[PDB]
């Protein structure tokens, strides 16, 4: 398992590293190809829309025809998309690359989630999902760093590197993932987790994407200060995801843990609103994301638990609605931020309270059922 789980973690890391690889080099591509702002908005939207559309079907196909096949095809698609972006000198080629990348993500993430759920002992699933969330975050962190480090020779080298990594990951998955040994439909158990993940993503991506702008406009944070705050928050979140998430899973339930994390998030966000000092903002930023960083593995575990033999479908639903929230969040957040500097934090607090209400309602329904 320590070799199959490692290759699954590598696949998910590759997907989320390729996601963030494009940030440092987007203006260079726009200037080189003579693209407008409408083109930039379309290029951003295409990947997210493709992932949204493909993720549930990808998970269903992983359930039906086997997860290893869907993962391998998704890795092939990832390599094709990265190479297409590497050699693309036209807007249509770039849009096709983004679409193929979104489809590859919507095929790889549901399959990897379902397989990690399937090959895990019942007492180890939570730890594995916490590790997966930490790996996803690490890929997000390392994407832009490698993309900007390897753009000093050419703004197209990162995508050649990413395509090569996709080839290596596909070969590793073919060799190392075990072939399957052998081999719900109700749309009522999945309603609360999809609503929860959608609301939480919509309100949390709003605060995450505009954090640097908010800190620069509020407390005069230089780029190194924002980097310090982001790295401290990421270190604390990773430490809690890797070490404490599974211990909380044995003690509490998924819903109780989610509610407590959301209440902690509300408290710390309120404390962040009323902070105007440099060191106050730094110290609050260090700990303001811990509950949010632990909510994602908890939601993945809840999706896994409420499912039966449809782990891939649960992964696909999670991917679809997480990406939907992550796309719609910052767009609304920036419009609100133009009128008040504290608007994204207000959206985060509001969605946290709504999530607490949703979790409590679902817990009460469960108690009434039993």
């Amino acid at each position: 398992m320590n070799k199959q789980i490692f290759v699954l973690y590598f696949n998910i890391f590759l997907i989320f590293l390729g996601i963030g690889l494009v940030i440092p080099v987007l203006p260079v591509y726009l200037k080189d190809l003579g693209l407008t702002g409408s083109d930039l908005g379309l290029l951003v939207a295409a990947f997210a829309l493709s992932q949204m559309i493909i993720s549930p079907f990808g998970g269903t196909l992983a359930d039906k025809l086997g997860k290893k096949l869907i993962i391998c095809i998704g890795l092939i698609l990832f390599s094709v998309s990265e190479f297409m972006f590497a050699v693309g000198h036209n807007f249509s080629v770039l849009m096709l690359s983004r679409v193929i990348g979104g489809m590859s993500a919507g095929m790889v993430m549901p399959g990897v989630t379902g397989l990690i759920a399937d090959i895990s002992p019942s007492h180890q699933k939570a730890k594995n999902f916490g590790y997966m969330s930490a790996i996803i975050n690490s890929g997000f962190i390392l994407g832009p760093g490698i993309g900007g480090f390897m753009a000093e020779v050419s703004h197209r080298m990162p995508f050649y590197f990413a395509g090569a990594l996709g080839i290596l990951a596909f070969i590793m998955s073919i060799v190392l993932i075990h072939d399957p040994k052998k081999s719900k439909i109700n749309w009522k158990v999945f309603i609360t987790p999809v609503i929860l993940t959608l609301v939480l993503s919509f309100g949390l991506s709003a605060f995450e994407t505009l954090y640097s702008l908010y800190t620069a406009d509020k407390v005069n944070y230089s780029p190194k200060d924002i980097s310090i705050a982001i790295t401290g928050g990421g270190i604390f979140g990773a430490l809690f995801q890797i070490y404490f998430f599974d211990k909380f899973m044995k003690y509490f339930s998924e819903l109780t843990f989610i509610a407590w994390s959301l209440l902690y998030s509300v408290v710390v966000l309120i404390l962040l609103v009323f902070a105007n000092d440099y060191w106050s903002i730094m110290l609050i930023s260090f700990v303001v994301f811990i509950g949010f960083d632990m909510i994602r593995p908890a939601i993945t575990n809840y999706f896994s638990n409420i499912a039966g033999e449809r782990q891939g479908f649960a992964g696909g639903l999670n991917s679809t609605f997480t990406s939907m929230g992550n796309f719609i969040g910052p767009l609304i957040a920036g419009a609100l931020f133009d009128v008040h500097i504290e608007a994204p934090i207000y959206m985060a607090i509001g969605v946290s309270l709504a999530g607490v209400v949703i979790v409590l309602i679902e817990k009460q329904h469960r108690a009434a059922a039993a």
């Epitope: 963030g20 908005g41 995450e208 505009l210 620069a216 780029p223 920036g334």
Partner: antibody, heavy 129, light 106 residues
Framework: EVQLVESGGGLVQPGGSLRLSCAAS????????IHWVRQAPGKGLEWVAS????????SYADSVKGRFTISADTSKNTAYLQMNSLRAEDTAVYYC??????????????????????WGQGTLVTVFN | QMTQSPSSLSASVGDRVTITCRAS??????VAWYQQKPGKAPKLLIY???SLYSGVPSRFSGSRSGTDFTLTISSLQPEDFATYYC?????????FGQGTKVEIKR
């Protein structure tokens, strides 16, 4: 994709009022605002006013506050700049521009790109009569 | 509305040019760059990007040094002889640069 067209500029009396219109068309995956920027003959660029497309919130320059009023109507996606008590320093070419911000989510890192993406042709306003 | 150095410079095609804009000390947000040719509207040249991302080499590269910002043109192509403006945003207002004109030498 988006087009901005100015209208309503011309000769005005030194003390009268004049209304500029910016007609805007086109859709983008961004947060947008409509701004007015004037250029005096031979001089640089000066920002004068701004209004938000959603939850319309106005903003004005210090040298123009009180005299000017920006508004928008979304029935035809149009913006208006009504300037009253026009003075000597108000003769310039007025452009309406579109500030657009695009977002790319990636955890607590991630890109945004903002600027005055689209500009109009501009209309000349001469205050002295 | 913001100080730009130099006010006007002249250089030959193929040369590398740097334009410095002195930005606000009350905000630390990035700066957008605009290009204007005579008789036409200004054109957005460089977007205002996230503070974490600024410095990737390119033909038109923006670089933040302390409180100042720098626009670098690596290769002076013939059609980029124009006036260049820096723009900074804030809570609600917008500030433009004084303007630097680039002229062709002979």
């Amino acid at each position: 994709e988006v087009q901005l067209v100015e209208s309503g500029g011309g000769l005005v009396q030194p003390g009268g009022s004049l209304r500029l219109s910016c007609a805007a068309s086109g859709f983008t995956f961004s947060s947008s605002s409509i701004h007015w920027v004037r250029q005096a003959p031979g001089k640089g660029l000066e920002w004068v006013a701004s209004i938000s497309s959603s939850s319309g919130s106005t903003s004005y320059a210090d040298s123009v506050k009180g005299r000017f009023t920006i508004s928008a109507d979304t029935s035809k996606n149009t913006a208006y700049l009504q300037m009253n008590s026009l003075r000597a320093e108000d003769t310039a070419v007025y452009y309406c521009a579109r500030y657009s911000r695009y977002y790319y989510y990636a955890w607590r890192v991630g890109g945004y790109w903002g600027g005055l993406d689209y500009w109009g042709q501009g209309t000349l306003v001469t205050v002295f009569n | 509305q913001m100080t730009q150095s130099p006010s006007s410079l002249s250089a030959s095609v193929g040369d590398r040019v740097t334009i410095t804009c002195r930005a606000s000390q009350s905000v630390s947000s990035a700066v957008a760059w605009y290009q204007q040719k005579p008789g036409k509207a200004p054109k957005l040249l460089i977007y205002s990007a996230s503070s974490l991302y600024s410095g990737v080499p390119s033909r038109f590269s923006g670089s933040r040094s302390g409180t100042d910002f720098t626009l670098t043109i690596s290769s002076l192509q013939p059609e980029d002889f124009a006036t260049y403006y820096c723009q900074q945003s804030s809570s609600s207002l917008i500030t433009f640069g004084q303007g630097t004109k680039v002229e062709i030498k002979r």
